């Protein structure tokens, strides 16, 4: 009930335009209004997960208007095993024909007013928190 | 850079040597074709008149719009010393070199030439079957020995010596092998006309004591010769020169008469495609080329998987690119080879994308890319991976008694451009090993 209510709000309400889904909605879910997708971190080396999740934004209702291009991002940490997993999981889309573009830097990202954990103090606070993660008569008496 | 290269070499030659060079009409005719169009126009006017023209008169011919071209033309002619500026009677008179004027006059009017263009024996040979095959194979063999692909008949010592000492195909005895360098890939990229001059120009610098003019004399008239004809035999130095010419597949001898080849004629700046390949998102290469030379050059940075008679199919891999990068081939060069050897189909689809891009928004006109941008990004990214670590050799300075001394020593190093890194808080700075002595010398002083 709750997820459906969130899903309905995300679709028919202009106030909410973004949702944070998990592996639950990775398959056989119809989201015609979805156009943009972001994947902060995901299921290791699994390939079908990458393709099936990409299928959510392939449902775009406005897929025929001129100049429309759905967006599919995969944020990967540099110098980490995620690169090994990331290059392995997207090995099915390349076979289909989709090509991945490397974005080393996002233009205009520094001019944004506020960003998460900008000051060193906030960054260290996050570091410590993540590091720290691991007889009916008797009844009347009382 | 063909006319620039040949012209630049001539400028460096001393004027005393240039005067002797212009003796033969043949070389003068070849040198005449190298000057800019405006220079040729003035030269032709001055060759047939035995008089003196003031400098200003030639300027009057050039229109106001083409005034800039006049400066380049006069500068080029003066540098070669073809034009002799003489000042007298308060005016800067202009005259042509007497040797050059006579040399050109004989060639055009058919005067005494002293067999500069050679003689005809009237004993011709089939050009297609023999001349084309011999030079093509001989030029093919040297190229294969340069790209590193195995080949039975290795080139002779003469050309082998030239290649080594030159920047081409750096070799090391400890390694015991020969590999291509950054300039070597460019040499392969350059068209045949520029490919031939690079070897010839390097040879001209290699010869010692053999006269510089004589070697230049032989080379220039060689182009004047017409393929598929006989030419009886010349200077004593030209004899050993002629035999050495056979090593490069420019002239064919049975064992008295020498026959020029297609390359010989091509030397004098003569005016689907083979090598075209398909680059796509899947990093798969499909080169519609049937020739070992094209296959060998592709293997430098392409992991070949199989070959058909019509084409060769392969795949770009991280290992293949790193192999080329380690030798010294730059990524920018690799993309240039891919772009200049593109398939016609790729251009059409790219143009179709451009046409649709213009249709949606014609306000943006970016340079079209024949091959998908993803391949470019990955190839360059791999280059960044190899340049991930940057290291410099040198020494470190520390424990300065006074801050003024540290600033003075650091300031001088910056002045002579030997200071790499410095930190004011630690009063430390690192300098390159090349300028280590200079900084130490200033420390004593
Ligand atoms: Mg379904």
């Amino acid at each position: 009930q709750e997820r459906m209510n969130i899903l309905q709000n995300f679709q028919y309400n202009d106030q909410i335009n973004t949702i944070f889904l998990s592996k639950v909605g990775d398959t056989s879910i119809d989201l015609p209004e979805a156009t943009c997708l972001i994947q902060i971190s995901s299921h290791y080396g699994s390939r079908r997960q990458e393709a099936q999740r990409l299928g959510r934004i392939l449902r775009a209702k406005r897929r025929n208007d001129e100049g429309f291009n759905a967006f599919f991002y995969s944020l990967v940490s540099k110098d980490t095993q995620e690169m090994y997993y990331s290059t392995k999981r997207q090995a099915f889309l390349v076979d289909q024909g989709y090509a991945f573009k490397v974005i080393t830097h996002l233009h205009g990202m520094e001019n944004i007013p506020n960003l998460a954990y900008a000051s060193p103090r906030e960054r260290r606070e996050l570091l410590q928190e993540v590091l720290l993660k691991n007889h009916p008569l008797i009844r009347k008496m009382y | 850079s063909l006319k620039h290269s040949v012209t630049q070499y001539l400028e460096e030659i001393p004027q005393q040597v240039q005067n002797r060079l212009y003796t033969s009409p043949a070389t003068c005719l070849a040198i005449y074709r190298i000057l800019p169009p405006l220079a040729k126009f003035f030269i032709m006017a001055m060759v047939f008149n035995e008089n003196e023209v003031p400098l200003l008169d030639l300027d009057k011919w050039v229109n106001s719009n083409g005034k800039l071209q006049f400066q380049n033309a006069i500068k080029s002619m003066k540098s070669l010393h073809l034009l002799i500026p003489n000042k007298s009677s308060g005016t800067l008179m202009i005259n042509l070199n007497p040797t050059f004027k006579i040399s050109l006059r004989n060639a055009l009017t058919g005067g005494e030439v002293q067999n500069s263009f050679g003689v005809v024996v009237e004993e011709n040979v089939v050009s297609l079957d023999l001349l084309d095959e011999y030079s093509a194979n001989k030029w093919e063999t040297i190229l294969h020995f340069m790209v590193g692909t195995p080949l039975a008949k290795i080139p002779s010592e003469k050309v082998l010596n030239l290649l080594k000492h030159s920047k081409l195909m750096e070799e090391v005895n400890s390694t015991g092998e020969f590999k291509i360098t950054n300039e070597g890939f460019q040499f392969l990229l350059q068209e045949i006309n520029s490919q031939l001059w690079t070897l010839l120009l390097q040879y001209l610098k290699m010869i010692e004591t053999m006269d510089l003019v004589d070697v230049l004399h032989f080379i220039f008239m060689l182009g004047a010769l017409e393929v598929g004809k006989a030419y009886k035999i010349l200077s004593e130095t030209q004899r050993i020169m002629l035999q050495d010419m056979r090593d490069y597949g420019l002239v064919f001898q049975k064992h008295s008469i020498f026959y020029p080849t297609k390359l010989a004629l091509m030397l004098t700046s003569d005016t689907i495609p083979d090598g075209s390949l398909i680059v796509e998102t899947n990093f798969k290469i499909y080169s519609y080329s049937n020739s070992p030379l094209q296959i060998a050059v592709l293997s430098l940075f392409v992991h070949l998987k199989a070959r058909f008679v019509n084409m060769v199919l392969g795949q770009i891999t991280r290992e293949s690119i790193r192999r080329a990068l380690t030798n010294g081939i730059t990524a920018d060069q690799i993309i240039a080879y891919l772009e200049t050897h593109a398939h016609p189909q790729m251009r059409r689809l790219a143009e179709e994308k451009l046409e649709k891009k213009l249709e949606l928004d014609p306000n943006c006109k970016e340079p079209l890319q024949v091959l998908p941008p993803t391949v470019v990004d990955q190839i360059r990214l791999w280059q960044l991976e190899l340049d991930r670590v940057i290291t410099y050799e040198g020494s470190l300075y520390s424990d300065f008694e006074t801050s003024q001394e540290y600033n003075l020593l650091s300031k001088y190093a910056q002045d002579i451009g030997v200071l790499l890194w410095k930190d004011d808080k630690k009063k430390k700075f690192f300098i390159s090993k090349e300028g280590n002595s200079q900084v130490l010398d200033f420390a004593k002083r």
Side-chain angles (χ1 to χ4, degrees), chain B residues 102-120:
Chain B
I102 295 168
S103 67
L104 281 184
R105 259 174 77 172
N106 291 323
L108 304 187
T109 63
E112 62 186 342
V113 65
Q114 294 177 334
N115 292 336
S116 183
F117 305 118
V119 304
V120 178

Side-chain angles (χ1 to χ4, degrees), chain B residues 239-253:
Chain B
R239 308 312 317 292
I240 189 69
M241 178 57 184
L242 171 54
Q243 290 182 334
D244 197 301
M245 187 65 74
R246 314 185 278 191
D247 291 345
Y248 299 87
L250 277 64
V251 66
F252 180 76
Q253 277 182 193

Side-chain angles (χ1 to χ4, degrees), chain B residues 124-136:
Chain B
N124 59 359
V125 294
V126 59
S127 74
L128 182 72
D129 296 331
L130 269 291
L131 306 183
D132 197 324
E133 184 66 8
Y134 165 80
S135 177

Side-chain angles (χ1 to χ4, degrees), chain B residues 301-351:
Chain B
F301 62 91
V302 175
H303 185 194
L304 303 171
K305 215 162 272 172
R307 155 173 59 162
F308 285 15
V309 299
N310 199 12
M311 61 157 285
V312 170
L313 72 164
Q315 183 190 3
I316 294 175
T317 50
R318 188 163 178 265
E319 171 171 86
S320 68
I321 288 279
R322 255 178 155 166
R323 182 146 38 68
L325 294 171
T326 288
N327 288 337
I329 313 187
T330 307
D332 291 331
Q333 303 184 354
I334 285 159
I335 178 164
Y337 182 86
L338 270 68
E339 185 177 1
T340 198
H341 285 87
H343 199 287
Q345 181 58 77
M346 295 168 75
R347 204 152 278 132
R348 285 207 308 192
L349 188 151
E351 197 276 346

Side-chain angles (χ1 to χ4, degrees), chain A residues 8-27:
Chain A
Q8 292 303 99
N9 186 24
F10 161 70
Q11 291 179 150
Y12 305 160
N13 190 342
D14 296 18
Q15 292 299 321
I16 298 302
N17 306 304
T18 80
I19 43 167
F20 277 71
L21 295 195
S22 178
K23 187 180 167 188
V24 300
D26 71 314
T27 50

